[PDB]
Symmetry: C3
Subunit: 125 residues, 3 copies
């Protein structure tokens, strides 16, 4: 069954405002250590952060708790499978937290057009 569904919209310009405001700190707050390794070489760094920000917020909604406790930005990682499809990877605290509530899997889709970045998330079982 569907445990929950989630969506989030992120403006590129809002990310730009947040970058200026918090400086380095924002990305360091949103991105996981794994994600932070490749961020400096990101061809479109604004899109990179926007994608992660939308996906994690959408994730938090779909799991029904919001960014709280184990469900934290640093625990929710966005990676890609062999064919380039984006997938969630979880920190150990957050990986385990899901089992407890019976959440088996969380699917992700992301898209962008100009200033708008959209994340679509569905949690199963």
């Amino acid at each position: 069954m569907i445990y929950g569904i989630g969506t989030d919209i992120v403006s590129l310009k809002r990310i730009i405002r947040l970058n200026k405001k918090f400086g380095q700190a924002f990305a360091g707050r949103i991105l996981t250590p794994e994600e932070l390794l490749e961020f400096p070489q990101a061809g479109k760094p604004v899109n990179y952060l926007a994608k992660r920000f939308a996906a994690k917020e959408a994730f938090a909604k779909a799991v029904g708790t919001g960014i709280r406790g184990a469900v934290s930005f640093r625990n929710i990682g966005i990676g890609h499978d062999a064919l380039g499809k984006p997938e969630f990877f979880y920190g150990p605290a957050l990986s385990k937290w899901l089992e407890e509530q019976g959440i088996s899997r969380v699917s992700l889709s992301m898209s962008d057009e100009e200033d708008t970045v959209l994340a679509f998330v569905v949690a199963e079982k």
Copy 2:
């Protein structure tokens, strides 16, 4: 299983124009009796209408009929759970229809960024 899915996006500015054109005749058309009673006390009347308009349209698509018969604006209500998350409530005629179609529950996800309000709906079983 999935009975159907639905989505709709609404511009806050479009809502403002619709209010301009029709007055409350627009709100009277889109809102349920329950919503219409509490609408005057809405802190954000434009955002209030935008959410209702998007969610109801997305609902109608998800059940595969569009606005038709019991699947009407006045039968599709949007309330909020204790945690403040939007959720659907139904006029008795629509509740009966959903049971007939074997739809067990209809999930609702909502997002907003600036001028854009987005609703995604999944009708289950």
Copy 3:
């Protein structure tokens, strides 16, 4: 069970520019023979193309491959039922591929608000 999910946002302006750039060849490249046959009767030709473009991209994401091989613009058709519900129709190469992956069904929803066109897709099994 969910095989995968997909979403895509398309600007009408992007379609207009593509149409200017490539002329008729664009529609011929994006649309299936059935879609192309009915294209001249479209009430809003630009929206007609924009919707198909988004839906096909969202489909391709949901099946996890992106536009590649049998998962192609030519093979991914969008039609509407009697009640106006959008549905996918497949060239024989694609329906063959879907059965091989065990993908039983693929649901679709489309919406638009001014310049923004949006598609949501969920592939089951």
